[PDB]
Write a protein that binds this ligand. Structure first.
Ligand SMILES: CCc1nncn1CCNC(=O)N1CCN(C(=O)c2ccc(C)s2)CC1
Length: 121
């Protein structure tokens, strides 16, 4: 299955599933700097799932590896900002990360396989 472009719709469908997950609710929009006034002293690069979806739809990802780096940044930002391991929003991030990693693994493998096939000769 050597379609070099297939990752994009695969990533659109996975973002749809993430938006249906109740665990995604805190990550569907950029963090509110009014409620978390110290957020940007800790977090150098804010990221959220609406920004990832807009970047994809604008044609501003070249590969699913780039999309994966931004999604992983959502989760590392949560882990760095959490005042506790036993916090609600952080705990939701860990379940959502497990779900995302379970689903992205085939998208990445198929893409890298397709690119190797394109440069086989
Ligand atoms: C637009 C407002 C809105 N309306 N519905 C949801 N959101 C969420 C917006 N994002 C946000 O405000 N968040 C707080 C920071 N955060 C964290 O990862 C944290 C880690 C542990 C903590 C104690 S907070 C990410 C979620």
């Amino acid at each position: 299955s050597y379609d070099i472009q297939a990752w994009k719709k695969q990533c659109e469908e996975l973002l749809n599933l993430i938006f249906q997950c109740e665990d995604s609710e805190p990550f569907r929009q950029p963090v509110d700097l009014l409620e978390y006034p110290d957020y940007r002293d800790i977090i150098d690069t804010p990221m959220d799932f609406a920004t990832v979806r807009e970047t994809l739809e604008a044609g501003n990802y070249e590969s699913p590896m780039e999309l994966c780096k931004d999604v992983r940044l959502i989760f590392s930002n949560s882990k760095a900002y959490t005042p506790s391991k036993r916090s609600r929003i952080y705990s939701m991030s860990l379940r959502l990360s497990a779900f995302f990693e379970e689903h992205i693994s085939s998208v990445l493998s198929d893409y890298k396989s397709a690119l190797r096939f394109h440069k086989r000769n």
